[PDB]
Structures are given as C-alpha cells and as structure tokens.
Subunit: 356 residues, 2 copies
Amino acid sequence: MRLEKFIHLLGERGFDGALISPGTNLYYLTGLRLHEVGERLAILAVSAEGDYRFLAPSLYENVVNNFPATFWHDGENPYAKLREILEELGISKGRILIEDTMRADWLIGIMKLGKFTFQPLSSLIKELRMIKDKEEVKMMEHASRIADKVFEEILTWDLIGMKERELALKIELLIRELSDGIAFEPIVASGENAANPHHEPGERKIRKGDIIILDYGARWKGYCSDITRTIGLGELDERLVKIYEVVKDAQESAFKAVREGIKAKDVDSRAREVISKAGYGEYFIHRTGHGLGLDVHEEPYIGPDGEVILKNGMTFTIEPGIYVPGLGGVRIEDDIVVDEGKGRRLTKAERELIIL
Amino acid sequence: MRLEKFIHLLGERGFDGALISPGTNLYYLTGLRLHEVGERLAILAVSAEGDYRFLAPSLYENVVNNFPATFWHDGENPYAKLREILEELGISKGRILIEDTMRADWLIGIMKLGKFTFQPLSSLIKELRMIKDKEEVKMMEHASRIADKVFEEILTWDLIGMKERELALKIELLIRELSDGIAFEPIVASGENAANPHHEPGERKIRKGDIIILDYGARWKGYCSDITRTIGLGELDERLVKIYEVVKDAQESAFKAVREGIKAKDVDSRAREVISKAGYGEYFIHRTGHGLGLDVHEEPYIGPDGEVILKNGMTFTIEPGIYVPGLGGVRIEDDIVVDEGKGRRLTKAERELIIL
C-alpha cells in the first residue's frame, strides 16, 4: 500500500520516476533488505505510471523473494541493463527522484543513461514516513522499552574506574544482546567531556563526582529508539546539580506543549524559554529534538527553524541540553509520538537526578 | 606531500578541481577524520591551481586543527558557502572529481552551483594510494601481526558447541581490544557453510568433524589487515584434507610468482592453475586477491582481469579457495607487500592444517 501511495504522490508532484538504492527508503517501500551491497549496483526503479522493477546482483536472487526483478552477473554492465529497464518503464528522461544516500559514483554512472533532472528522494518520501502507522508505532514502542531496560541495567553496574570507551562498549554489547542492534554508536561523556554534545567516547576514566551523559539507541525490526540520560557518580558539583533541574524543567515543558496543530518551532521555543529564564541560554547549542523511525534522524525537526505542523503519528525526540565548557553538561531525551492529539512518551526511564 | 602530488596529478590528467567528502580518501590526503558526519555537508574543495579549502560544520572546529577551513552553523545553507568557496578557488564550473562514496543528495546540491562534468575520485587517486610508502607499510605490518596474535588466541578456545555467530563475536571483541577496531565484520563458516564464500555467521553449532573458515581483519591507524585460516575440529573428511593441501600449494605458488614487473593477472593464474590441474577448477569462484590499505578492498585486483603491473610498495591479498557444496570449503589468505622486487608476507600465521 506504501509503494502504491508513493507512486501516486510521484505523479501528483510532477515527477516521472525515482531510483532507490538500498537503505531505509527501499525497505520502507518494499520490505527488501540486502546485506552489504557495497559497490554492486542495486536499484529499485519506479515509474509514475505504476510500473517498477528492481535491478540487483545475481548474488541476491534469494533475498529478493518474488519481487519483480532483473539480475546481472559479474561481467555485465549493470548500468546498461538499468538503461534497458528505464526504457521499458518509460523513464529514460525526465524529473527523477534519487535516494539521498546513494553513492555518488552510482549517480554519476546513471547520469549517462538519459536526460534527467534530479531531486532527493526525501523531499517527497518524508510526507509518508513522517506519519507512523499503528505497526510502526508498536515497533518504536518495543525499541523504547529496550532503551529503558538498558538504562536500568547500566545502573546496576560499577562505573568507577571504567573508561568512557569501555562503558560505551558494554552498552553496545548489551543493546546487541537485547535487540536487532544499536541504532548508532553509543555515547558516554563524563566530567568536562559532557560539555561537547557530539563528544566521541575515549580514554577518560570515570571517577567519583563525575557527571555522565549517556546517549544510545536500539533497533527493533528496523525501528529506532534514541534516549539520553545524565547521571552523577557520588556527589556532583553543585553548579551541575542546579543545571540539571533546569534541563529537566525545559524538557517536561516542551513535552506538555506537544499538541496536534502546533508548529515544531513552538515546541522548541517552549524548552528554549525555560532555559533562557534560568540564564543558560548560551549553553543550549542545538535543536530540541528531531524525528525518528527507520533512521535516527528524520523529519520533523524540532528547532527554531522547524516549520512542520505536528499531527498524529509523528514521532520525534525532545532532548534539550545545557553545555558549559570546563564544567560539563546535561541532556535528557525522550522519544515521543503524537497520539490522540497529545504528546505521549515512548521511553519511560527515570528522569530525576540519579546519584549512583 | 600527498595533497601536493594529488594537485599535480589533477592538472596533468585534465581536471580543474576535486570535491572530497569525509572518508579514507580525505584522510589519505589530509589526515582529517570526521566522526559520524551524516547529513552535514563536509567538503574539501581542491583546484588544479594549488588552492584548497575545507568546508565543515562548526561541530568539528577543534577536530580540524589548523587546516584551511570555513565552518558553517546549523541553520545556514552550507551549499551557499561552498559556492563562495568554489568561486574564489576558480572552480565554479569545469571538470571535477567526486569522492565515490559521497552522498548523492550532496552531489545533487553541488550540481546547482555550476555547470560541471563529473568523474569518480578513485580513477585518479588510486595511482597514489596504490603505492604504499614506508610508514603505511609499518602500519599494515602492525595490523597484520595483530591478526596473527588473534589467530594464536583462537586456537586456545573451546570451540565445541559454540555458535558461528558467537565465535565471530569473540573474534570481534579480541580484535577491538587489541587494535583500533575491526577492518570488517568477522566471518565464521563451519561445516557445509564453509561452502559459501559470502556466508554470514549464523546459529549453527560447531561440532566435531567440522572444518572452519576464519576470516577477519584489524585496523591500526587506519590501515587494514585481512587474514583467513581454515582449521579442523577432530578428524575431518579425507576429501577436505586433500582439498586443503591443494589450497596450500596454490596459495604458495601464487605467492612465489609475486615479483616486480609481472602483471597482476599472472599471479592469479599461477594459483588458479595449481587448482585446475588438481581437478577443483569449477570450485574456485573468485579472484585470488585484492589490494588493501586504508580500505579493505582497493587496487590492484589480483584476478583474471587484473592489468596492473606489479611494483614495489603495492600491498594485496593472496587468498585462493575451494568451495564444494554440501561438503565444506577452504581458503588460506596472507597479506603481501611487494618489497625489493619480491613478495613479502605481512601476515605470518601458521599455514599448515591444524586439527583441534
């Protein structure tokens, strides 16, 4: 039903076709999932007229089930074969949509197969992936349930003396034990390191009195969870303890604002005000949240520039934070779904400051 | 020196400039490594004239040391900044090289900034990366020894009853403990699964009278190693015991042929023949080897179609294998460098058939 919707949306937006290499959009539209395609051309070609065919390497003729395909064996010109296909479907010319993540060398080769005008696939497919159906929501619910479990386990561990890199690996292994896999490399940021929102876990040793930001995600049947919790070891610097209650206030505030009909930027400003009034405006260096589903980052974005009007079925994160260089930082992140016109938390983990 | 050679080569070959997104190629040329850039435009623009600039998101400001860079902040159009950059470097039109792995949406956005003709960066960059300098070789030698240690280590585990997936997991962790990370996901193919070269370690438990293909690699300062050993647990089927002897001699013959001045395909043919003469020809379904370095697969390709004339500094694998359905499989792989006009094994792990 999705592929058919997408096709309808294509015509209505004036496009003549789309070329979709392996990834989440391909999966979304067909359920197809190839393992490590690499440099071998694999492309789902779709006509606005309703016709479609998937060109893939002979190696994958078992994973493609009975999906309308054409294979090419090592030695053939995949690109020439694709051209044949584009000819049948009648799209060897026109305004074509291209999967955002496709390798540039594939697009370059494809550029020689006809007169085309390109556009990123997401400019249009977001309209579909942004509104989660009932099953997708159930899936994101389970992934959030796992993200919660992992937090509970981490709290029974002995962190003192562990290096960030080591803690992150334990988390990753735990997530690979509980689910399909990590939605992204876990992030552990302690002490002063928690001041950089995009910090990469390293050799810093966690000690008594260290604040710790933990950000990780699990995948469940393709859907992702993304949760962040900030914990303290022993007694935290009083300046960070204060900061924490504010961030907590900012997040709960942005959450209560979640209503069908309100603009995304308004959910952002709601957290942003709480943090400005407390005086830490200059330390909240990123958006309040972003959407999630099959990818960690997708529409809609919850920042000062978010123009999307929230509607039921949308799923995104609410994770404001405060970062102070040389001191540390705090972030609390929840995964949210718009349900019955209201904001509902998919993740339930403890939001109060936890002093291990 | 590298960037400068690259600039020289650029001009000699006809190109006006190059646009290089994050990855091995960017690292090779500038030592720059950007963690999980994702959707954020990050590009090194280079003109054939000698000028060059790196556009990156502000987040990486400290990770870019003193490299000539322009930073953009979430909320601006990085494509607009790139325009200015191309304008000043004189490359807002012309023939440009594009990082093969660059996101298609980036290339599409770049297409709006001018009238270009593209070509994949690899077609030219391979000339430089194909000849490893002394340090690079030291790096690889380090990754190779680590691959050897891991093999010695594996021979001490109790493999009976262990799932393929569980062993690969143990190998992965040992590799991550001992180096900078895995070169790729470890492969463990037991029993009849050893028949599929592309086998993905599964839930099959390793029992006695089982042959096991162990393929994994490590990374040291960006450089890779790729080794493969096949062992037997308890006594194996005599047929396999002999197929093993074939592979051993084959791998040895291809190795002995390695010399400066001969064509890649001839090394392949040397091993390929040893196998045919034994009658196992239709069971050797892939190239004898491939070059390695910052990537697991690179020039030159040691197969039927390899036209590269071998020289000093080239590093590649010699990994011939026999795969018989319903029976099993065997492959012995070493990493080789052309040193002093002769081949020199970087990987030294025992090659005799080991039974546990």
